[PDB]
Amino acid sequence: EDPEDPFTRYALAQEHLKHDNASRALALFEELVETDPDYVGTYYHLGKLYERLDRTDDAIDTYAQGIEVAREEGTQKDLSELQDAKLKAEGLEHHHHHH
């Protein structure tokens, strides 16, 4: 129940979003990445926040990292959610890749 704890500071990040403090929450999520890179919950909601901030490519990259840490450190459950998460994201906007 201290700001030190991964889930706690993660919860405070959510609290910021509740108050619409997107940038302050973002900083905490990005902090979680440098502190606890195996904390899958970060990657999921961090990507969602990037989507809200129009940072689609950053979101997809965050989900990609999420997929890897999800299967290795987390579980198949989050793996599936993150794979689907970036997939629907890549389907949102037509990023220009000439074929």
Where are any strands of DSSP class E within 35-79?
none
Phi first, then psi, for residue 95 (nearest 5°) are -55, 130
How many CB atoms neighbour CB 15 within 10 A? 13
The domain spans of the chain are 1-99
What is d(CA 32, CA 47) in angstroms, rounded to the nearest whole number?
13
What residue type is assigned to position 23 of the chain? S
Which residues contact residue 83 at a Cβ distance below 8 angstroms, ignoring those fewer than 6 apart? 63, 67
Tokens of 99: 């074929």
Q: How far is CA 42 from the centre of its chain?
A: 5
Q: Which fold has domain 1-99?
A: 1.25.40
What is d(CA 51, CA 83) in angstroms, rounded to the nearest whole number?
15
Question: Helix and strand tally (H, E) in the chain?
Answer: 5, 0
DSSP SS3 for 20:
coil
Helix pair angle (76-92, 56-72), 10° resolution: 160
Q: How was this structure determined?
A: NMR
